[model samples]
Target: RPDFCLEPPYTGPCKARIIRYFYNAKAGLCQTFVYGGCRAKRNNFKSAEDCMRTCG
Candidate 1:
């Protein structure tokens, strides 16, 4: 991570832990995920701890 791109850091290397990826029906190249990952990132929870409780 560089000083410019990293606002918050990840526990480990940022890999594609994402469950799924598909085209957004309403948006452009905009790929979306199945559940918690996006919300986790949005809410600024590095670990997807409460992701399922709210996102699910």
Candidate 2:
């Protein structure tokens, strides 16, 4: 597991709170996945030396 979890030593919670986001059609982020034309950037992720060196 990663450094953090929903609960410490998380062993499957019954209910979880989800984020609220709108899925729109104009900007086309939704279709980009199914049509395979866009790859969004990752924001706050740190990797090992090798992975960080080649992240694009």
Candidate 3:
């Protein structure tokens, strides 16, 4: 993604570790998705703390 910096910017489909994080309203914290790799949205993070720190 353009906003993420773990990897150098690239074009087209590329192999990468895609991790997702979402706000768990019920738990009042950010939660992560499975490490199924391939692709991710701009909202994805390189680490759990990266997501938590941003949204928690």
Candidate 4:
């Protein structure tokens, strides 16, 4: 149940910086991070509530 939530947060290979969130199942925390504007997969969320719900 935790594989998706356990992966490292990915900041894409771009110069543009965006505020994003990722869940750390190990820490049981929804942490904030910088996301590069190129692309992302299942680990990125737009808001604190978004990530909190997904991994809350």
Candidate 5:
């Protein structure tokens, strides 16, 4: 499955991944802030490493 979005379209926390997306200002992209298995933004990622490899 794909990662979740960290946007404010939802309430409380993510239900499954329990994840969050954080912006990487240095890279000018959004990265996975955390993961617990839940809803997230489409722009979100699995982790910073993945984000770096993919986005970078």
Candidate 6:
């Protein structure tokens, strides 16, 4: 998984707080999160399917 699922959700420096998705390693599923319209790592995804496609 290249440690992708281990990556955590980051709200980033901005205040956007937009809905996003990320892989949860412990749960073995994709979860919802808020993105701050700024910097984000590979864990961030626009949809749960995207995270699953990558992390799974």
TM-scores of all predicted structures: 0.21, 0.17, 0.39, 0.84, 0.34, 0.89
TM-score pick, better of 2 and 3: 3
Deviation from native of the Cα of residue 37 in model 2, angstroms: 34
For model 3, the superposed segments whose C-alpha errors exceed 4 Å read 1-21
Ranking by lDDT: 6, 4, 3, 5, 1, 2
Off by over 4 Å in 5: 1-17, 21-40
* Candidates' C-alpha lDDT: 0.32, 0.23, 0.50, 0.82, 0.47, 0.86
Candidate 1 vs candidate 2: which has greater TM-score?
1
In model 2, where do residues sit more than 4 Å from their true spots?
A: 1-19, 30-56
Tell me the deviation in Å of residue 10 in model 1: 27
Show model 6 residue runs off by greater than 4 Å: none
lDDT of 5 by residue, 1-56 (tens): 12332232232364554455554545566644455455444545546666545544
Question: Number of clashes in every candidate structure?
Answer: 0, 0, 0, 0, 11, 0
Q: For model 4, which pairs clash?
A: none
Q: Tens-digit lDDT track for model 1 on 1-56? A: 11222223222334446453333223322233443333333323323434323332
1-56: candidate 6 lDDT, tens digit per residue: 86856978888899896999999898999999889898888899899888888898
lDDT, residue 45, model 6: 89
Residue-level lDDT tens digits of model 2 in 1-56: 22221111111233433221222223421111111122212211222332223322
Candidate 4 runs further than 4 Å off: none
Identify the superior model by TM-score, candidate 1 or candidate 4: 4
Q: Judged by lDDT against the true structure, how good is candidate 6? A: 0.86
> How far does residue 49 in candidate 2 sit from its true spot (Å)?
27
User: Which candidate leads the pack in TM-score?
Assistant: 6
